[PDB]
Write a protein that binds this ligand. Structure first.
Ligand SMILES: Nc1ncnc2c1ncn2[C@@H]1O[C@H](COP(=O)(O)OP(=O)(O)O)[C@@H](O)[C@H]1O
Ligand SMILES: [Mg+2]
Lengths: 96, 97, 49, 145, 295, 149
């Protein structure tokens, strides 16, 4: 709760005028991934997030670039990439 | 002239009426895959954009598919033929009035 | 909507009357024309609206 | 339009210098940067709309077509003729342009080489104007004297 | 020639090492390492050929001919040996942990990177940062920077460099930029920890989006964190030193507050029990004095 | 050569530059004054005319009227005569605004960065000659006034 209050305080410190619509650009820094002997659930979630974003990068790059290649479809043929780990990360939770 | 109008204002009025009459020359077509419109020929687009002297590429992207200031996020939504037309006559009526 | 007017019965028709009534507009193009090259074409939209 | 910058760790000793190859080898193998190398070798990494390409790169054309207010795609075809490239270097799309790496840098090199003569010619014109003004000043000073 | 007689084959001192092409019998060849003159047999076609030895320190690995790896490793280690840390691949960049200090963040270089083409100067993270703004302005909107790596290494310095560079570019006299910059020390010193892999840590996922205008200048910002490791506090073990806040506010304050408070020594604390002397970072005057001035 | 009125103008200019003795003619002097006399291009003329890169002494460089004339008529054939189209196109490419909001700063940058270079003296005579307001010209009036010699 003290950390929450201090982060809200620094927010209000940076709470200058909030205009809307002009432009923006985002920057993200995730926590790292480590393999240590004794781990709780939170570090497992962090590692799952890292694997999730790596899969996001791979799928984004390959699948999306190839789908625009078909979308214009001037002169192109299907190419093989593979490297998909979505079934591995799906095992986290699905009550179905 | 008798009312006290310089000739340049009359030329500007003629420019406005020329723009509103030339505005309807825009022709759109389907994208063959989705509801997105297609704009293959910008002849009339270039003429009219130069008539108001604004950036056509920004104008073209906005008119063909505008970005909505919905407040949630920044999103541009695909439109249809009827939406583009409705915008065309809305602009025409606003200009004339 | 056939009703008896001043002179006689008249014939009406619904053709998206609400659409004509609201008369939507695009803010993006309206904001674009807020700043234009020619003075008069700006005057068509220089007023706050 | 995301952009990525990766990082690698060279050792477990937590010191500086004298790294070990196989650790970073495994790191790059799992990261799959080699797949990005394959796609950059094969795939086309540049997409440009027709109009901005038409306006931005016109000095090298050296043939200013005056048929304004029409023929955007025809202007693109004329620029392709002005580029005299082999069929593999270009693949015109419905609304974008497909190229391969290296053509863009060549374009900026050509245009930066081209603009030099124009700017130095304008500079020489300004020098001539200043020379004429100075000569007129000296002449009027002499006649006043 | 026609084989270079030094094609890379897998080794143990390095991942791959050269091989001398000689008499071959059914792909079985007893190649010798020209660097060692040790004839070793080989049957598998594990040839990793090289480009001719004239492309020293290739700016981008696209002029090559064979898509091998040992030559790639050779280029990477050549760049590493000379401090050229910002090598990049096709459409993205890769770095290695320097563990050293270089004066590459000079303001003159910042000015020299101001608005140039990608192929004009040697690659550097400031060049990407500056290219980002022009990329945002040339198209409609929505630029983004994403970075990702094993554990925490550089997961923070590059973001700091980006923030500093954008603050330098941010202009129209810099008090708001100074506040935005000093915000990171506050959260960092209030959030850093000590870990076996790195005594510099980050107990959360940090995200930020700058807010621009038509000119592209800062108007405001907002930061949202994600799941600080709450359990770190009570548990304690080797290198499991909880947080710098306690370790440097145990004594980093006036004696008057010591009398007012109920602070204890490194042994009297029932909760705290370890030797915190492996702290070669600073002398903890900064942590409270500079934090107070920043606040 | 044309009729003798150009020779008379050359003689009166010869009287006009009488510093350090009227008799001896300096290539630095004649080039500049003849640029004032309707010869805009002078960059390549330092090497094309002299045929010698020896530009050491500004005091005694041997140029005489007798050989100064035929060289001038050979140069008078108008080796190159540019026209305003390329100039205005290059300025518009150089123009980052299209109307003339703030031109002085980048004009100074390009002039101090250009190969032939301009010292700041040219910078203060820039503000004169109708170029007083901050970008009052959209690169057509300045073209007309510079093309007046
Ligand atoms: N780009 C860099 N330049 C210089 N030093 C760095 C860089 N990245 C990391 N370091 C050093 O490595 C340590 C860890 O930093 P970093 O990886 O950014 O944070 P974290 O370890 O929490 O991810 C820091 O103490 C810093 O001195
Ligand atoms: Mg970190």
């Amino acid at each position: 709760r003290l950390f929450r209050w201090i982060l809200t305080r620094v927010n209000k410190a940076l709470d200058k005028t909030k205009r809307q619509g002009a432009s923006f650009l985002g920057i993200l820094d995730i926590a790292g991934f480590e393999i240590f002997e004794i781990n709780s659930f939170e570090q497992l979630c962090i590692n799952y997030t890292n694997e999730k974003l790596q899969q996001l990068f791979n799928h984004t790059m390959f699948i999306l670039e190839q789908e625009e290649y078909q979308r214009e479809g001037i002169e192109w043929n299907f190419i093989d990439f593979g490297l998909d780990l979505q079934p591995c990360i799906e095992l986290i939770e699905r009550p179905t | 002239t008798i009312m006290g109008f310089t000739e340049e204002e009359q030329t500007s009025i003629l420019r406005v009426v020329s723009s509103v009459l030339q505005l309807g020359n825009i022709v759109f077509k389907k994208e063959r895959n989705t509801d997105q419109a297609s704009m293959p020929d910008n002849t009339a687009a270039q003429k009219v954009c130069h008539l108001m002297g604004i950036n056509v590429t920004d104008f073209t992207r906005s008119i063909l598919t505008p970005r909505i200031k919905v407040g949630r996020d920044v999103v541009q939504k695909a439109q249809t033929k009827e939406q583009a037309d409705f915008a065309i006559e809305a602009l025409a009526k606003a200009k004339f009035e | 909507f056939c009703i008896l007017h001043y002179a006689g019965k008249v014939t009406y028709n619904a053709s998206a009357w609400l659409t004509k009534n609201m008369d939507p507009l695009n803010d993006n193009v309206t904001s674009l024309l807020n700043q234009s090259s020619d003075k008069f074409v700006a005057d068509l939209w220089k007023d706050v609206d | 339009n995301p952009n990525f910058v990766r990082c690698i760790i060279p050792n477990h000793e937590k010191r500086a210098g004298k790294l070990d190859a196989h650790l970073v080898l495994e790191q790059l193998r799992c990261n799959g940067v080699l797949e990005g190398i394959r796609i950059c070798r094969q795939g086309f990494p540049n997409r440009i709309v027709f109009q901005e390409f038409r306006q931005r790169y016109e000095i090298l054309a050296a043939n200013a077509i005056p048929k304004g207010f029409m023929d955007g795609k025809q202007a693109c075809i004329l620029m392709i003729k002005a580029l005299e490239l082999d069929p593999n270097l270009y693949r015109i799309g419905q609304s974008k342009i497909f190229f391969r790496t290296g053509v863009l840098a060549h374009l900026e090199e050509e245009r930066d080489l081209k603009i030099t003569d124009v700017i130095i010619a304008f500079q020489a014109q300004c020098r001539g104007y200043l020379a004429r003004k100075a000569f007129a000043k000296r002449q009027q000073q002499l006649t006043a004297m | 020639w026609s084989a270079k007689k030094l094609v890379w084959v897998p080794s143990e001192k390095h991942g791959f090492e050269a091989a001398s092409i000689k008499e071959e019998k059914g792909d079985e060849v007893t190649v010798e390492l020209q660097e060692n003159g040790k004839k070793v047999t080989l049957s598998k076609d594990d040839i990793q050929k090289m480009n001719p030895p004239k492309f020293s320190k290739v700016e981008d690995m696209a002029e090559l001919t064979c898509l091998n790896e040992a030559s790639v490793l050779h280029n990477l280690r050549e760049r590493y040996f000379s401090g050229l840390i910002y090598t990049y691949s096709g459409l993205f960049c890769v770095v290695i942990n320097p563990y050293k200090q270089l004066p590459i963040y000079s303001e003159k270089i910042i000015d020299m990177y101001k608005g140039k083409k990608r192929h004009e100067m040697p690659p550097h993270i400031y060049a990407i940062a500056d290219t980002a703004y022009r990329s945002m302005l040339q198209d409609r909107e929505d630029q983004s920077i994403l970075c990702t790596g094993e554990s925490g290494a550089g997961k923070t310095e590059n973001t700091k460099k980006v923030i500093q560079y954008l603050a330098v570019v941010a202009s129209s006299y810099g008090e708001l930029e100074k506040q935005l910059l000093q915000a990171n020390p506050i959260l960092e010193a209030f959030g850093n920890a000590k870990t076996v892999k790195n005594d510099n840590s980050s107990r959360f996922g940090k995200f930020i989006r700058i807010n621009f205008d038509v000119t592209g200048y800062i108007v405001g910002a907002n930061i949202e964190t994600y799941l600080l490791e709450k359990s770190r506090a009570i548990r304690q073990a080797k290198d499991e030193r909880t947080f710098h806040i306690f370790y440097y506010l145990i004594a980093g304050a006036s004696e008057q507050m010591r009398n007012d408070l109920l602070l204890e020594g490194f042994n009297n604390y029932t909760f705290l029990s370890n030797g915190h002397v492996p702290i070669p970072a600073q002398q903890d005057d900064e942590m409270f004095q500079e934090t107070l001035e920043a606040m | 050569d044309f009729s003798e009125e150009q020779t008379a103008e050359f003689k009166e200019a010869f009287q006009l530059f009488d510093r350090t003795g009227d008799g001896k003619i300096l290539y630095s002097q004649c080039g500049d004054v003849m640029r004032a006399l309707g010869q805009n291009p002078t960059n390549a003329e330092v090497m094309k005319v002299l045929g010698n890169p020896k530009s050491d002494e500004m005091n005694l460089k041997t140029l005489k009227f007798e050989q100064f004339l035929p060289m001038m008529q050979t140069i008078a054939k108008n080796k190159d005569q540019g026209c305003f189209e390329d100039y205005v196109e290059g300025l518009r490419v150089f123009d980052k605004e299209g109307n003339g909001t703030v031109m002085g700063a980048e004009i100074r940058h390009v002039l101090v960065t250009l190969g032939e270079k301009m010292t700041e003296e040219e910078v203060e005579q820039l503000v004169a000659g109708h170029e007083d307001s901050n970008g009052c010209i959209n690169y057509e009036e300045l073209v007309r006034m510079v093309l007046s010699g």
